[PDB]
Scaffold this active site. Structure first.
Site, PDB file in Angstrom:
ATOM      1  N   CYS A  43      -0.469   3.833   3.084  1.00 11.98           N
ATOM      2  CA  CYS A  43      -0.904   3.175   4.359  1.00 11.98           C
ATOM      3  C   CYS A  43       0.545   3.421   5.266  1.00 11.98           C
ATOM      4  O   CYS A  43       0.281   3.223   6.611  1.00 11.98           O
ATOM      5  CB  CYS A  43      -1.026   1.672   4.002  1.00 11.98           C
ATOM      6  SG  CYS A  43      -2.483   1.269   3.358  1.00 11.98           S
ATOM      7  N   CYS A  87       0.862  -1.241   0.145  1.00  9.90           N
ATOM      8  CA  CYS A  87       0.099   0.106   0.073  1.00  9.90           C
ATOM      9  C   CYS A  87       0.942   1.351  -0.011  1.00  9.90           C
ATOM     10  O   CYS A  87       1.897   1.328   0.741  1.00  9.90           O
ATOM     11  CB  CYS A  87      -0.908  -0.181   1.032  1.00  9.90           C
ATOM     12  SG  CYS A  87      -2.106   1.536   1.478  1.00  9.90           S
TER      13      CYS A  87
END
Lengths: 225, 116, 130, 315, 145, 126, 382
Positions: B42, B39
């Site tokens: 993230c 990600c």
């Protein structure tokens, strides 16, 4: 025959309590006059006006400059450095005395100073000391009015009398410009002045004092010998 | 082991442990973080959650779930995007909250203080 | 010769820059004589919706004692700092060529060839962070 | 050496052919004083010691690491059509010269195929130019061929490599001033130098700053309470002060490893060995002849350059 | 020297106009020969003997065209006045900021195949900068010897 | 006093603020270097920094530039410096920061005559 | 709705319908490689080696609108936000970059980005969640549709996320009907959310109604092989001959850039389609038209800056560049040469968008995109 010399103030902003700005204009100046006026006024404003400031700070129960005090977040040297930036006003030549006696967990600003009758502070929130615990804090100060930068000796020890090499700078900055007027055959020019002061004086007063100091200086020649 | 402090406070839990935590009795608000290593945004969410887990020392429990490990469980929780947070009230009467995207930490504080 | 300057035209204008600059400056100064200082020093003084012409200036001087020196001062009193700072380019001893202080943003961007491919936002920090 | 936070870090990472069982400054040949085409990812080529022992004492590359069998290793990104898991490897000098290490780019497209574009490389001990299809490894780090001193120079690619030695050597003689100031233009390595210098005071525990005085900082986190004592005024081995200062005010929280207190010449979380000053390049009156500078009074009454020096007299 | 004043900016380092074509053409012949060298048309020595000769001839052609460019288009360029008047700066030294630094030498003699085809104003690349360090070391193992 | 690009120096004189050259905004110069030192030592990298510093001082931003930025582009440092200078000259109306006839240079005045030095001078904040 | 006096402005407006969100990555699958569960300092190693579906990950529609307006175009966004601080800051962020917000509706019933669910423990011990109260973004009804953006806009762009909620299905179809009544094109972006990656048949059933209404469709390489056959198109990619290669390129084991024939994409083709775009990251763009098809060749580089590389948001920039060049040049529809020439601008924008951290922080400018396009591509191509 054509026009008369006029000067005026075109802008004046108060950016802060201890910072003032002012721009001025002059009108139909013939050749050569504008450059002389501009350079003379810039030199006079940068190095002729006088402004009072604190020169010596005396503290109680402190060994030396680089020492710590219980209940105070600021070291003694930090207090001297913060104290040099206090701005004051006066018009009488001569040294004076002042004091600051404050209690403990308060937070000490420039309004806590005690001043002689003819001396006043301009900003009233300049941080000078921070206090956390209850300790009686008493400091004596000396105020002086000189011209330009002056450096003092560490003499007159007492318990401790730390001399701060205060800078006597009431005018922060100066600028000027010489434009063109396009008066046909006759060559005229428009002169703009620009003064930034620190609140000890104001524009139209720093200009006044700077003109008068210069006309002081140029004067001996008028007398014969 | 009590000699050196842990660098990271958020503890990674499996799907079954999260099910037990939600089903079992609780007295503090619960935070469930959905994240993956690949990600992009993230990392910032992980940093913000790590910061949040320090201010709320013992008044909240913060855990994270890795969708690369538990994919079907994440799908069942109605997750349609990686930077997802779940706020679980300590009481069974109040319903849960799902937040999507890189939300600011201050709104997280508002969420688990004024709404949980 | 065509649409873009060639490598010989550029290396010749590099030799003869000052002549064209002097022609531009001479034209700009010659504009002051016909236009007059009042209207000439009004492009940089925005928010003064006056007449700016040495035809109604005389009419105003006939209506009121202010000559073609106090109307100029009055206009040069709502200048704002930025407009004056930009206007300073017409100084008698700075002498910025008129083409330079009137070029569009597109033309100026071609000096270094547009925006950098690598964004500058990766370099910019904030001077008051820990 | 504790002249400034930079020198403490620089001193630790040094290599020398001298010492017991090694060459000396008198019986050392001239080939041993040259850059071999193997001190590339391991030893900086522009940071040495001037004088007789030139080329015998050097620094370490930023990414260099002592691997097994006491061999210096450097990181390189492996190019392969498998996508294993971790594409970076730590190559040793013995395994370095038998691979084709590209240092080019993929930002070039021709009417044919992109895989035939040419980039400079380094095979054996030469410098070739090869198609992208015969590249085994690819260095990707900018701070890989230099040391700590040489990586603090902005726009180093525009400076002659002859001047880099003394550009690096004149940063280890900097005097930590009274009050510090951060540099407008930098290379971004000052932060890690400040972190690893040891001058800082980094938190070893979580919690909130519940007490701060200019002699100590007391933090409360996970039950126990931790007191960190500051360094108010001390003396360095080169007669310079080491004055710390708290950073975060009362009540705020810190994670593990974050900055708690500043230090000497370390404003913010960054190294700061100088000050930003307005400068104009021009010959004034011959007072800047050769290598002379002409400063103004503004640098002496605003304490722009003012430092404390502590001398220790022992009897 | 004050009232007139002089200073060094970024656009006063005036690269000669024709460098855009000469370097491009020099690259073409290096691309063609290195492409035929894989076809067996030429042998290794011929490739070595030419990659040293294009960049030496091109670099020495820009150096000899520097002053005629300066002396006709920009006679008062700050770099030109500093060096042409004989105050400070060789013709070769100015060539490093303006022109080409190509064909540095391996320490054990012999030239390096990769040529430094960029100025110090434009900025050397990583491989080109590392090559320039070879001559940097044998500048301080000489002042000490 | 030394810079980061090998430009060392020995302080020779200390002048009062009214005796030093000032830019077109009136600010006195804080230090004067010798231009001839650049062609000799051949360290142009200072000049870039110099100009770039000015932009920072007029924009309240700090740059952390990794070395060898000429890989993305050709003459990328020139683009960065000139774009930053133009942005600083446009956001704050200081048309002397980026003069579009000799970029990076400006015409400073004399502190003791009120005269402009005949050629533009490179100024910055190193 | 007929109120207007003067003709519309020069750059045609773009209609961006969807949900306003900050740093959202819809397309999520199971990545084979993971890099430590706690230490996020090493997660950037997954940006140099993407999991082949996050190679060019698209995001929300606000990102596409911002990238389009930053490339020299004009865009407008239709959506709903709550009367919160986050909702008031999202619209501020969109407004700061000249994105028209005349069609953004503020409401107080729901909270921005917050949706109320309920725990629904099923058989065994597997928990579930059912949306009790919908989030503010997905709560737009057909009544509050700005009938001025739809009339003016020449391209209607939306993504598949709006197909995951009931009310937005009807609202989106009403907006599509209105825009088509006013003569605007329909641009479909297939950034599939996580629940839509379950099975091919269910997703094809879900998106069929939206698919049949689209005039231009943009899908990734994985979002097409998933929609046709994952196993077949994965077996075909990893295949090397047992004895001898075939031509010579097969003897070099280069990457597999397969140009799908018109008889394989036929199940996804219909009469109303004007363009089908399949993007293999920024590497290649396969374009299919009613009368021709081809592939545009590009490159990528994230190791040029290994510490500030973040692939998120590049697909949005690619789509925004495609839309900008579609609206600027109206002759690309029936000219393959012009189509190929104008499709490298999108590749340059996608390359630039991967050089910085943050989807909206580092979207490229038009001048920077043109500079990179001219610096990477030979003068004959550009």
């Amino acid at each position: 025959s054509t026009q008369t010399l006029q000067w005026k103030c075109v802008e004046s902003r108060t950016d802060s309590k201890c910072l003032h700005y002012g721009r001025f204009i002059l009108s139909p100046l013939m050749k050569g006059q504008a450059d002389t006026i501009g350079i003379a006024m810039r030199r006079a404003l940068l190095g002729e006006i006088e402004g009072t400031c604190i020169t010596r700070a005396k503290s109680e129960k402190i060994p030396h400059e680089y020492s710590t005090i219980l209940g105070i977040q600021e070291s003694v040297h930090e207090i001297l450095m913060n104290l040099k930036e206090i701005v004051l006003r006066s018009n009488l030549y001569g040294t004076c005395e002042a004091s600051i006696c404050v209690r403990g967990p308060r937070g000490v600003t420039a309004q806590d100073i005690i001043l002689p009758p003819y001396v006043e502070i301009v900003d009233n929130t300049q941080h000078i000391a921070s206090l956390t615990e209850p300790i009686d804090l008493c400091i004596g100060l000396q105020l002086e009015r000189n011209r330009g930068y002056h450096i003092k000796a560490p003499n007159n020890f007492q318990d401790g009398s730390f001399p701060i090499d205060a800078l006597f700078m009431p005018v922060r900055n100066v600028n000027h410009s010489i434009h063109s007027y396009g008066n046909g055959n006759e060559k005229q020019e428009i002169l703009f002045l620009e003064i930034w002061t620190n609140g000890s004086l104001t524009p139209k007063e720093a200009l006044y004092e700077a003109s008068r100091n210069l006309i002081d200086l140029l004067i001996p020649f008028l007398h014969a010998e | 082991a009590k000699h050196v402090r842990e660098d990271y406070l958020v503890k990674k839990l499996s799907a079954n442990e999260i099910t037990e935590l939600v089903r079992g009795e609780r007295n503090v608000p619960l935070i469930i973080d959905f994240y993956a290593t690949w990600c992009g945004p993230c990392i910032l969410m992980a940093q913000e959650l790590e910061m949040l887990a320090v201010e709320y020392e013992k008044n909240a429990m913060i855990v994270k779930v890795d969708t690369d490990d538990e994919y079907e469980f994440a799908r069942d929780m109605q997750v349609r995007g990686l930077p997802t947070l779940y706020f679980i009230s300590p009481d069974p009467n109040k319903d849960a909250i799902r937040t999507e995207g890189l939300i600011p930490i201050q709104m997280m504080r508002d969420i688990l203080d004024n709404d949980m | 010769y065509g649409e873009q300057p060639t490598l010989t035209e550029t290396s010749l204008y590099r030799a003869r820059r000052h002549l064209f600059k002097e022609e531009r400056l001479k034209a700009e100064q010659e504009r002051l004589e016909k236009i007059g200082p009042m209207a000439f020093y009004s492009e940089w003084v925005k928010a003064w919706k006056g007449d700016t012409s040495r035809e109604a200036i005389q009419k105003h001087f006939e209506e009121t004692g202010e000559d073609e020196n106090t109307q100029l001062i009055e206009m040069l009193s709502h200048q704002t700092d930025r407009e004056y700072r930009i206007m300073m380019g017409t100084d008698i001893r700075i002498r910025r060529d008129p083409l330079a202080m009137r070029m569009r943003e597109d033309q100026i961007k071609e000096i270094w060839g547009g925006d950098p491919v690598y964004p500058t936002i990766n370099y910019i920090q904030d001077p008051d962070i820990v | 050496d504790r002249t400034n936070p930079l020198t403490q870090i620089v001193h630790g990472r040094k290599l020398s052919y001298l010492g017991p069982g090694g060459l000396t400054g008198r019986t050392a040949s001239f080939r041993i004083r040259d850059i071999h085409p193997s001190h590339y990812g391991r030893i900086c080529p522009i940071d040495t010691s001037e004088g007789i022992n030139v080329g015998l004492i050097g620094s370490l590359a930023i990414h260099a690491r002592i691997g097994p069998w006491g061999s210096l290793e450097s990181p390189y990104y492996e190019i392969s059509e498998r996508s294993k898991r971790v594409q970076m490897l730590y190559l040793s000098p013995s395994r370095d010269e038998y691979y084709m290490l590209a240092s080019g780019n993929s930002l070039a497209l021709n009417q044919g195929i992109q895989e035939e574009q040419v980039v400079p490389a380094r095979y054996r001990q030469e410098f070739l130019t090869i198609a992208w299809e015969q590249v085994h490894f690819r260095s990707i780090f900018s701070f890989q061929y230099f040391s700590i001193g040489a990586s603090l120079i902005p726009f180093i690619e525009h400076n002659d490599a002859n001047r880099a030695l003394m550009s690096s050597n004149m940063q280890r003689q900097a005097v930590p001033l009274s009050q510090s100031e951060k540099c407008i233009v930098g290379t971004g390595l000052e932060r890690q130098v400040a972190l690893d210098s040891g001058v800082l005071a980094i938190a070893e525990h979580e919690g909130k700053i519940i007490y701060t005085n200019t002699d100590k900082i007391v933090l409360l986190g996970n039950g126990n309470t931790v007191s960190i004592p500051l360094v108010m005024y001390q003396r360095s081995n080169k007669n310079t002060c080491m004055h710390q200062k708290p950073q975060i005010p009362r009540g705020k929280c810190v994670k593990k490893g974050q900055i708690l207190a500043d230090g000497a010449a370390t404003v913010g979380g960054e190294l700061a060995l100088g000050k930003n000053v307005l400068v104009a390049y021009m010959p004034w009156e011959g007072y800047n002849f050769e290598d002379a500078v002409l400063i103004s009074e503004r640098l002496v009454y605003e304490d722009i350059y003012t430092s404390f020096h502590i001398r220790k007299y022992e009897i | 020297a004050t009232a007139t004043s002089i200073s060094l900016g970024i656009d006063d380092l005036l690269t000669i106009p024709s460098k855009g074509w000469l370097v491009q053409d020099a690259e073409q012949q290096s691309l063609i020969l290195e492409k035929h060298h894989h076809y067996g048309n030429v042998h290794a020595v011929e490739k070595l003997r030419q990659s040293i000769e294009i960049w030496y001839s091109t670099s020495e052609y820009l150096r000899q065209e520097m002053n005629p460019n300066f002396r006709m288009t920009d006679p008062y360029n700050p770099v030109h006045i500093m060096s042409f008047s004989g105050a400070r700066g060789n013709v070769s030294q100015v060539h490093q900021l303006v022109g080409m630094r190509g064909l540095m030498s391996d320490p054990q003699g012999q030239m390096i195949d990769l040529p430094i085809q960029s100025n110090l104003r434009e900025g050397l690349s990583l491989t080109e900068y590392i090559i320039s360090c070879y001559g940097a070391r044998k500048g301080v193992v000489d002042t000490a010897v | 006093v030394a810079g980061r690009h090998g430009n060392k120096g020995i302080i020779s004189r200390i002048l009062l603020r009214q005796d030093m050259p000032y830019l077109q905004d009136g600010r006195p110069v804080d230090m004067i270097f010798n231009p001839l030192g650049v062609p000799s030592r051949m360290n142009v990298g200072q000049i870039f920094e110099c100009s770039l510093g000015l932009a920072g001082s007029l924009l309240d931003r700090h740059y952390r530039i990794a070395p060898f930025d000429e890989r993305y582009e050709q003459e990328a440092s020139r683009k960065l410096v000139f774009s930053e200078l133009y942005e600083a000259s446009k956001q704050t109306a200081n048309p002397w920061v980026f003069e579009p006839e000799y970029p990076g240079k400006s015409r400073i005045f004399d502190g003791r005559t009120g005269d402009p030095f005949e050629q533009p001078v490179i100024i910055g904040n190193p | 709705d007929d109120g207007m006096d003067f003709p519309y402005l020069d750059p045609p407006l773009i209609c961006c319908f969807g949900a306003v969100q900050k740093e959202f990555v819809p397309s999520v699958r199971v990545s084979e490689h993971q890099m430590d569960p706690d230490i996020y300092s090493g997660w950037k190693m997954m940006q140099w080696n993407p999991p082949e579906f996050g190679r060019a990950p698209g995001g929300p529609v606000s990102n596409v609108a911002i990238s389009h307006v930053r490339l020299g175009g004009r865009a407008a966004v239709i959506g709903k936000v709550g009367e919160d601080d986050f909702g008031e800051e999202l619209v501020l962020m969109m407004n700061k970059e000249n994105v028209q917000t005349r069609a953004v509706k503020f409401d107080s019933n729901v909270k921005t980005a917050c949706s109320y669910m309920r725990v629904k423990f099923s058989d065994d011990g597997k928990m579930k969640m059912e949306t009790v109260k919908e989030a503010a973004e997905d709560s737009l009804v057909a009544s509050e549709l700005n009938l001025a953006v739809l009339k003016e806009a020449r391209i209607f762009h939306f993504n598949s996320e709006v197909l995951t909620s009931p009310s937005m299905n009807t609202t989106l179809f009403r907006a599509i009907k209105l825009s088509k009544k006013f003569g605007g094109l329909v641009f479909f972006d297939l950034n599939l959310p996580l629940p839509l990656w379950k099975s091919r048949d269910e997703t094809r059933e879900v998106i069929k109604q939206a698919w049949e209404e689209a005039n231009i469709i943009e899908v990734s390489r994985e979002e097409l092989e998933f929609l046709l056959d994952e196993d077949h198109y994965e077996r075909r990619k990893n295949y090397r001959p047992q004895y001898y290669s075939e031509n010579y390129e097969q003897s070099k084991n280069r990457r597999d850039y397969y140009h799908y024939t018109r008889e394989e994409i036929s199940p996804l083709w219909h009469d109303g389609l004007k363009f089908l775009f399949v993007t293999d990251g920024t590497l290649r763009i396969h374009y299919y038209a009613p009368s021709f098809d081809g592939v545009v060749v590009g490159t990528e580089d994230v190791l040029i800056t290994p510490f500030t590389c973040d692939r998120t948001g590049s697909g949005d920039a690619v789509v925004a560049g495609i839309m900008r060049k579609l609206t600027s040049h109206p002759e690309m529809y029936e000219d393959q040469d012009v189509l190929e020439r104008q499709l490298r601008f999108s590749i340059a924008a996608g390359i630039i968008s991967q050089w910085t951290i943050g989807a909206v922080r580092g979207f490229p400018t038009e001048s920077a995109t043109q500079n990179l396009k001219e610096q990477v591509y030979v003068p004959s191509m550009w």
